[PDB]
Write a protein that binds this DNA or RNA. Structure first.
Ligand SMILES: [Zn+2]
Lengths: 114, 122, 48, 215, 120
RNA sequence: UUGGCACCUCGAUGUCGGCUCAUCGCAUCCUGGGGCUGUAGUCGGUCCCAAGGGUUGGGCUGUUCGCCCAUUAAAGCGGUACGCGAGCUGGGUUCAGAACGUCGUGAGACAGUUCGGUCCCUAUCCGUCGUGGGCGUAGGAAAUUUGAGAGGAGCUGUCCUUAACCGGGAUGGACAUACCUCUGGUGUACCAGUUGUCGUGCCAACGGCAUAGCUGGGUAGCUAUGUGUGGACGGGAUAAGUGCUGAAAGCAUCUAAGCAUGAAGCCCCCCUCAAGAUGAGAUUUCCCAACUUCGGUUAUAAGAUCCCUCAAAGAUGAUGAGGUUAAUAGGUUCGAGGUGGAAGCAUGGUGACAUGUGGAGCUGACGAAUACUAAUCGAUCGAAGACUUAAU
């Protein structure tokens, strides 16, 4: 345990509807947005690069490429602004943190499947 | 985190390829800038043609810092490189195309012409 | 970097006010009527 | 109005509506009671005295603060309470609204309250001028022989001395600090915890005092 | 964790000697800083012995040293054989402990505080 | 400032510029308050009160100055041995080498340049930053406190509204302070990959040494560049001013008696320290006998301490958590977080290797249980309350 009274106070905010993924997987996060007038959802699909933490303080980081420029995005895992997560692929890796992918592009930066 | 002597990549088609930061505007003694902030710079490398020439002293907005921005939700966004757009003192761009993605923090700055010319705003 | 006046005997004996030592714990042993340090073994038919 | 004593157990985060993130401190304010009232006719000033944590009862041959002693076992027995670890000032609380023997409950505070938290900050040891104060290093090369030293401690023949207040090195750390205008985020009466928005002075298991803010 | 005045490479080798000496002599006089530290090293090894299997005899050999014990009438034994055979049968119902520190005075050439470590 | 004088220092009072750290004056650079204007508004010009806080980064030059570039509400001026070399640097300047122009018959020299070129000291006293012991405070203790006195803090951009003043809002810059939930750094007794070589007899598994051999991650703690908070609203008395009633002076006049109003400044308000504040304060609790030669004395009480297990505290000491009527450390058991699939075995492959058993196995500081080992037996200190007066 981390500590009683901390697992006992922050327990009503642990989500219980997300899938279970790993570093190396591919995700399609449906984040919610409030622009100038209304609520809309905007999808963000990339590779999971790291998960750290435990409890309500857990986070993960997914990485994509937009126009040749890499864009990695970081979320609190139980945040109430993720509408739903979907696991597209499940790649095969050998580390817990895929930090080496930051210096790679193209065929050098491909994660296997299965 | 841009400071004096930091070199950025230009992400429009105004003729410039690289700028050098001369001063971050804002207050007195102010040390660094980030996305949504306006710097004074100078063109170090241009493209043949275009209005902005090598050696000009211009103003630019910052887009895509490599140490990104934190949001009120505990969300973050980081980029792979630093970029900026040369602007016109009414806060409109000097070019007419914008390359690569751009951060959603440019709406509070009222740069509505930069966020609308750009491919996906993040 | 070096003394400007010599030190008088009075000022030397006051500085040495606190340069002293205290006796040890040194309780008596129950096995042999003796003296040993508290929480250590007895150095005389070593018991504890 | 609205004092209480408690112990710091650690930091966490909560999610407010609109999906914000809120850093939070967890305080454990359990077993507070009122031990004595001070009046202007007897003491000169009004206040109530509160004791926080339950302590074991008197025993002979007790060799530690874990057990009450005969002077303290009796003071907490004028009011009918068990012996307390911590016992504090509460001077900005109107005394007419308390009775000796009451149990200051965590529910006195409601979510939305502005509060001041006081505590003894952590404790660092002997520190130098650069860490203890905010002073600059000397050059680390170019011939330099001045790296973490303080500057010049005075001037010359005029004022042939150092002034009081020179900022030299010395013990840094554990002082008394208030942080003002913090917020109560949530009260949990079953566990008796106060979720304070932000962070507070001191180590974990350290004592804190929550009061309503002075504005 | 104490540091004992050495470097982390010398401090590691000095406890692998202290631990293999308790396994052999059953009783040693040390200083009281090396005794408080080496009790943790020899007790984490007793549980590998009384645990039993092959993968835990592979993890005891990362710490013990290659020394031979001469039994009675020339029946030699390795310090890893004496730990998984004989020290692991008398400590099969004790749940923690296994070792005992006893203080003595300060020794003479420096007033370092002598101590004895046993197996209980 | 350039000087006049030559009174102090030749058995030595260390230059210029820069760095670090400041501190005071006001003849005010910004911000606060006012009078006059040739002040229509927006901007000004001038003079008065005002020292609370604030008062920038570069290019060129050893430079100081100065000139430029880009900013700012602003880029104040001076003293303090032209502040500060037993705090630092040593670029200029006036040590020995060498050279150019120039002067000299010459040795040499500058009415001038050029390249090179040794900055010592273990703090005795006052000073000042921390932290202990002794005695005192008319009995001995344990807590909680009042606050005489002291130290901090004090800055002000833009935008929206009113629609230029006066009014209301929202957000910044720079500084302070506390903290590690978040994003990051470190993490030499944490996990993993890998090279050379010597070993455990060999295979397989492992150990030494090579910067921790090297490389990829990383727990606690410590941390900023990260996360929160602050300078808020106000009172009293005034400054320059603006006045009201009002005479000396049969009118007038802010003044002499009276009465108002008026500043980022003054005294508070906010934040810390504070009975050695010898004037040593106050509350509510605890303990309270024997013996004399009646002078007083012992041990004991309540309370501590020694010694020992410790960390949230720490140079030491002090502070805190505990000492068997015990969870204080270790071990043991179960966990959190970190690593990222152990060994053995079997299968597939000719082989390097892959798959399964199985989110496996290990895991230092973090959260809980458990007396298995150590905090054993003991010892030292520590009260019986002075006499005057006045009331009960
Ligand atoms: Zn004995």
């Amino acid at each position: 345990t981390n500590h009683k009274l901390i697992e006992a106070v922050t327990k009503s905010q642990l989500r219980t509807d997300l899938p279970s993924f790993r570093p190396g997987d591919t995700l399609r996060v449906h984040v919610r947005i409030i622009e100038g007038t209304r609520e809309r959802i905007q999808v963000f699909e990339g590779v999971v690069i790291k998960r750290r933490g435990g409890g309500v303080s857990e986070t993960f980081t997914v990485r994509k490429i937009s126009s040749g420029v890499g864009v990695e995005r970081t979320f609190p895992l139980h945040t109430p602004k993720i509408e739903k997560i979907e696991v597209k692929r499940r790649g095969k890796v050998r580390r817990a943190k895929l930090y080496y992918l930051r210096s790679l592009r193209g065929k050098a930066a491909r994660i296997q499947e299965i | 985190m841009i400071q004096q002597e930091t070199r950025l990549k230009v992400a429009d088609n105004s003729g410039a390829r690289e700028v050098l930061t001369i001063k971050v505007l804002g207050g007195s003694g102010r040390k660094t800038a980030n996305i949504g902030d306006v710097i004074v710079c100078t063109v170090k490398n241009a493209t043949p043609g275009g209005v902005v020439k090598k050696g000009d002293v211009v103003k630019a907005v910052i887009v895509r810092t490599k140490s990104g921005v934190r949001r009120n939700d505990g969300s973050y966004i980081k980029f792979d490189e630093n970029a900026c757009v040369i602007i016109r003192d009414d806060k409109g761009p000097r070019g007419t195309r914008i390359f690569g993605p751009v951060a959603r923090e440019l709406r509070e700055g009222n740069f509505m012409k930069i966020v609308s010319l750009a491919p996906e705003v993040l | 970097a070096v003394p400007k006046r010599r030190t008088s005997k009075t000022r030397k004996n006051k500085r040495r006010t606190h340069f002293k030592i205290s006796v040890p714990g040194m309780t008596e042993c129950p096995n042999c009527g003796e003296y040993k340090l508290s929480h250590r073994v007895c150095k005389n038919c070593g018991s504890y | 109005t609205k004092g209480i004593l408690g112990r710091k157990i650690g930091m966490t985060q909560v999610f407010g509506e609109n999906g914000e993130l809120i850093p939070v401190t967890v305080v454990e304010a359990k077993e507070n009671v009122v031990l004595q009232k001070k009046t202007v006719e007897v003491d000169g000033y009004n206040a109530i005295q509160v004791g926080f944590e339950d302590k074991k009862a008197y025993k002979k041959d007790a060799k530690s603060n874990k057990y009450a002693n005969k002077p303290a076992e009796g003071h907490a027995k004028k009011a009918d309470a068990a012996p307390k670890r911590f016992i504090r000032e509460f001077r900005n609380v109107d005394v007419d609204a308390y009775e000796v023997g009451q149990e200051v409950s965590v529910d006195t505070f409601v979510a939305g309250d502005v509060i001041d938290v006081t505590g003894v900050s952590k404790g660092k040891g002997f520190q130098g001028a650069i860490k203890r104060h905010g002073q600059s290093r000397g050059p680390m090369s170019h011939g330099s022989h001045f790296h973490r030293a303080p500057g010049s401690v005075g001037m010359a023949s005029d004022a042939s001395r150092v002034f009081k207040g020179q900022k030299m090195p010395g013990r840094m750390g554990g002082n008394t600090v208030t942080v003002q205008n913090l917020e109560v985020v949530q009260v949990d009466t079953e566990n008796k915890v106060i979720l304070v928005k932000g962070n507070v002075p001191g180590p974990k298991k350290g004592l804190v005092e929550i009061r309503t803010s002075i504005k | 964790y104490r540091k004992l005045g050495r470097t982390s490479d010398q401090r590691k080798a000095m406890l692998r000697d202290l631990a293999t000496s308790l396994i052999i002599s059953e009783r040693i006089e040390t200083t009281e800083a090396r005794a408080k530290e080496v009790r943790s090293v020899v007790e984490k090894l007793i549980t590998l012995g009384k645990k039993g299997d092959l993968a835990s005899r592979r993890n005891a050999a990362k710490t013990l040293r290659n020394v031979e014990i001469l039994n009675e009438d020339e029946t030699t034994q390795t310090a890893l054989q004496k730990l998984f055979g004989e020290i692991a049968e008398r400590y099969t119902e004790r749940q923690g402990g296994y070792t005992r520190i006893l203080k003595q005075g300060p020794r003479r050439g420096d007033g370092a505080e002598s101590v004895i470590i046993e197996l209980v």
